[PDB]
Amino acid sequence: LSEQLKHCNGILKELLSKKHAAYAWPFYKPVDASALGVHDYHDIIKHPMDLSTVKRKMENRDYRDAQEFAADVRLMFSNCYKYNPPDHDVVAMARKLQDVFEFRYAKMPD
Ligand SMILES: CCNC(=O)[C@H](CC)[C@@H]1N=C(c2ccc(Cl)cc2)c2cc(OC)ccc2-n2c(C)nnc21
Ligand SMILES: C[C@H](O)COC[C@H](C)O
Ligand SMILES: [Cl-]
């Protein structure tokens, strides 16, 4: 990986670590629409994203730069903000996790 992608992988590891598990856990795996009974999810969300998919893409060297990585992580949060009411518990968790993401992403080495 490039230096910037290393930093991205570091952030990714952090997002998946125990210290953030209390609010990161909904984002660990792809939304299972049928299991959650949200039968309109895939009509509303055209591009599902989650941290296991980001991890797989990082491992497979799918991401060519930090920008592409960040777009996926942000897409994941956006999907949450799109589907759920602004006052929902899972949205609060998304906001907190994105705060973790954005502040460390900002420390990207040049
Ligand atoms: C119909 C109630 N809303 C939902 O089920 C959400 C839409 C699928 C769902 N809520 C959750 C969710 C709801 C309440 C709380 Cl406290 C935490 C997560 C959700 C749960 C999961 O369990 C494996 C996985 C993904 C979840 N997720 C994400 C990401 N974005 N929205 C959700
Ligand atoms: C809560 C907003 O949707 C995302 O905020 C990011 C900021 C760095 O906390
Ligand atoms: Cl972006």
Q: What is the CA radius of gyration of the chain?
A: 14
Residues with CB under 5 A from ligand 3 (ion): 71, 74
CA of 39 to the centre of ligand 2 (A): 28
Residue of 62, 50, 53, 75 whose CA lies nearest to 5: 62
Residue 47 is part of a domain; what is its CATH number?
1.20.920.10
CB 96, CB 26: distance < 8 Å:
no
CB 58, CB 12: distance < 8 Å:
yes
Domains: count for the chain: 1
Nearest atom in ligand 2 to the alpha carbon of residue 81 is 3
Which structural domain, as residue segments, surrounds residue 39? 1-110
CB 76, CB 49: distance < 8 Å:
yes
Ligand 1 pocket test, candidate residues 25, 36, 93, 95, most atoms within 8 A of CB? 36
Distance CA 58, CA 32 (A): 22
Decide: 79 in ligand 2 pocket, CB within 6 A: no
Backbone phi, then psi, for 86, in 5-degree steps? -60, -20
Residue of 9, 97, 82, 99 whose CA lies nearest to 48: 82
CA of 66 to the centre of ligand 3 (A): 10
Tokens of 85: 């009411």
Question: In angstroms, how far is CA 86 from the centroid of its own chain?
Answer: 18
- Cα dihedral across residues 41, 30, 80, 24: positive or negative: positive
